[PDB]
Design a protein around this ligand. Structure first.
Ligand SMILES: N=C(N)N/C=C/CC(=N)C(=O)O
Lengths: 372, 371
């Protein structure tokens, strides 16, 4: 396999697809009114300018995450996909000649995009964010000028606490390190502190990437906030305009309501409760199988599964599941710098269509049982 | 200004924005049912797999342009924007180390993206696609490995003929040259023939880029087909998958019906009838400045302002006083901006009330500026 995405595109043709983690579950009772009134959000995007709709969505999201710093900043761009933002950040890191340490494990495409754009990439252990001594040696090594992170991390669910985030920013400022912050799974995290305030008050250069595609199920009609410090804003804007003039005001109006509704009824009611129900299903299905579900860490709409006791490796166990019409992700690609040293893991995404998920999970337990 | 896009973002804050050419006109009678039933498209995208929805839109488009070769090919990808496809092609041209000559003039972000990907770029004249000796002199030079075109070209409206396209396809075929073909304005062209079949028969490596954002006003909710030959498809698909897993099924299902309506009712009554009204309107409203005419009619208007004694940026700044934003033309000649400061570009596919009122406000400002 070339990439996780190739396994994902392969999984799009299977009856029970648990490969890609995109948000594709059914619209819950709370969001039904948004789809029932799609015309109002079509008309809202038509009646508001492109600059105004961009701030309307940004400040709506800033109210959701309770960050005044994000609400007051205007150094940002709106991309149709979060990968589009990682790519522009990749071009900026290469243009400014920044030796970037990339978190490991991470979704393979971040590494692939960083390499395609010609960035000097270094492997960076994810658990250094929770070990002060480990982070200090890498930051003081002088082999890197930028630090690319995913918080909370995919697929380990590792999440920095406020004291661990403040320690990381202060160390990067001391060594003039630029922080790249992939916050794709931010809403699933258990922490609740203003990371934008800690970033701007430090004065360091940073880029924070947001994303709706792993949270609200809008059929891959997504919006991705790209927020950056003032000192790098004009060059970031330049690189963004080489590709995009804007994103769609219609998409901005639709997702602005999804965020506003999540804020009104709360994240658990609209997001976290159904994720926890789907997490309990796979746990109860895979109890007593030799498959150990990774747990310590926040709960992502993904399930990291140790299959060491199964005797198979990640790829062949996934090949066995594919013969029973079940597509899963082999986990070695997430450890992009040490793939052969991590073959004891598969990943099962959760935010799939409801009927296909619960039936697919049942078929997964029957498939696991037959392979014994 | 450093780019055309930078001017386009500034125009968004003006009362009458004629800068960016993205289709933003109102929904005519032909497409209103589409909006009245946005729920139907939302449900259609949800009720079908991603691979099927990608093929369905491609077949639907192939039926509108009557191309059986596009209908039968499967080496294609779906990007949310046409520039996303341009960038993937530029990454391919760099990875395969192919020296590329890009058409001049052209929208500068084409040159900007190729440059950003580290492509060895050379310029070649736009009219070489209509002079057999001139093109033969370019392809046989041994300096280039690929040719990147916009057909029809923005903003001159130059459209190739069946004779020229076949001449161009065979000419590259002889000299190991890949053809990159930007058909973003395909619907506005007056010709109708199968470029895909002609490219398909030839056997040369090629990449064709489609787009909806210049044609169907969906508030920049867009779909861009990226079709390529078999010999380079696995590498093209590899580069696409580094960025995208998919596009949006809802976006595919929504614009598939836009393509379906245009096919059943005709491209004239749905698209071209209104641009003629808007082209004749601005042409009559400017009867000192000379509109570039010779060549299909794009949803744009190329205007020579040499008679005014002004350069494009100066005139555009003067027009900015009255809440009118337009595009300076020097950046379309990415390889020779200094020699081309005499033209201006105005976009016609704006909201209806904003356009017709805006054109009148243009004539009053142009009359006032010249007094
Ligand atoms: N953009 C891509 N080509 N692939 C994206 C994969 C995201 C995912 N499946 C996850 O984060 O779990």
């Amino acid at each position: 396999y070339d990439s996780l995405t190739e396994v994902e595109v392969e999984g799009l043709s299977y009856l029970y697809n648990f490969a890609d983690g995109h948000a594709y579950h059914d619209i819950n009772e709370h969001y039904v009114d948004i789809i029932n009134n799609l015309q109002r959000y079509w008309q809202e995007g038509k009646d508001h300018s492109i600059p105004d709709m961009e701030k309307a969505f940004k400040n709506q999201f800033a109210e959701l995450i309770d960050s005044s710093t994000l609400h007051s900043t205007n150094h940002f761009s709106v991309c149709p996909t979060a990968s589009n933002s990682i790519d522009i950040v990749a071009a900026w890191l290469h243009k400014e000649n920044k030796r970037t340490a990339l978190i490991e494990p991470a979704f393979d495409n971040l590494y692939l995009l960083l390499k395609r754009r010609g960035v000097d990439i270094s492997a960076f252990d994810e658990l250094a964010l929770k070990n002060e001594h480990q982070l200090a040696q890498i930051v003081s090594s002088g082999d890197i000028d930028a630090l690319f992170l995913v918080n909370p991390n995919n697929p380990t669910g590792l999440e920095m606490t406020e004291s661990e985030f403040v320690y990381l920013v202060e160390q990067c400022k001391a060594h003039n390190i630029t922080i790249l912050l992939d916050r794709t799974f931010r809403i699933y995290g258990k922490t609740n502190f203003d990371d934008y305030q800690i970033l701007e008050q430090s004065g360091i250069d940073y880029v924070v990437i947001e994303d709706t595609g792993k949270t609200w199920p809008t059929q891959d009609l997504k919006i991705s906030l790209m927020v950056y410090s003032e000192a790098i804003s004009s060059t970031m804007r330049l690189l963004y305009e080489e590709i995009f003039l804007c994103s769609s005001n219609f998409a901005l109006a639709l997702l602005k309501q999804f965020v506003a509704v999540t804020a009104k009824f709360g994240v658990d009611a609209t997001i976290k409760n159904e994720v926890r129900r789907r997490s309990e299903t796979i746990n109860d299905a895979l109890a007593g199988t030799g498959l150990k579900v990774f747990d310590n860490k926040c709960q992502l709409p993904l399930c990291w599964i140790d299959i060491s006791a199964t005797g198979y490796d990640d790829v062949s166990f996934a090949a066995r599941l594919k013969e029973h019409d079940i597509a899963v992700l082999p986990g070695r690609f997430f450890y992009w710098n040490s793939k052969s040293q991590h073959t004891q893991f598969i990943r099962v995404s959760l935010m799939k269509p409801d009927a296909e998920f619960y039936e697919g999970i049942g078929k997964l337990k029957e498939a696991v049982t037959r392979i014994l």
